[PDB]
Write a protein that binds this ligand. Sequence first.
Ligand code: DMA
Ligand SMILES: [Mn+2]
Length: 220
Amino acid sequence: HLDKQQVQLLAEMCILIDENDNKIGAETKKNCHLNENIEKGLLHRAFSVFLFNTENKLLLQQRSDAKITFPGCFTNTCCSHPLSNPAELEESDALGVRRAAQRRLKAELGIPLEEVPPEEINYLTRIHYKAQSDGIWGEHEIDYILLVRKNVTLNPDPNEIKSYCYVSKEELKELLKKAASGEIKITPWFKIIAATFLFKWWDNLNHLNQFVDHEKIYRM
Ligand code: DMA
Ligand SMILES: [Mn+2]
């Protein structure tokens, strides 16, 4: 009964990890997102991209109604998972995750691979969180937060997103208030980052060295 193309993506192989983000196996995206498996501890690696343009506006997307988890929710630029293959399993300088981010930026938003090569993708820190989308589907990940600063071109896949918009800080606040009123919905990872680190980073977009932490995994 769910969207066919999204169903086909449920077969992708995700990277299973222990609570310290050490790789321990691989499992399908479907199984990694079933609350029944999450309830037993199944945890996978993921990433969340926050992309800002020269005007310092953050690029948001509204997930399409076809997404199996949190459909129609407003959220940050891109969120997905590195796959269990040689290229994206690469742990050196989080290269696997940055390659996966480049791949999904192209697949979801239509950003050319060349505009967002790994060297343009800055890995800030990791956050561990768990949530439920519905009675059946949910999330449980150690999420690599990645930041991109560039004036990209876009050509999104409507199967992935039903809308996108660059927002200023004040515009994001009006957005968050509309979410608090149940007017609109936002994803759990965006809610967590927005309530903790987002605005701090946004103020130091030029000096995010003091905001990089590759040692600690923040437990949210
Ligand atoms: C980090 C995280 C929450 C991955 C979720 O990805 P998504 O549902 O936005 O897209 P997909 O799961 O289809 O790659
Ligand atoms: Mn996930």
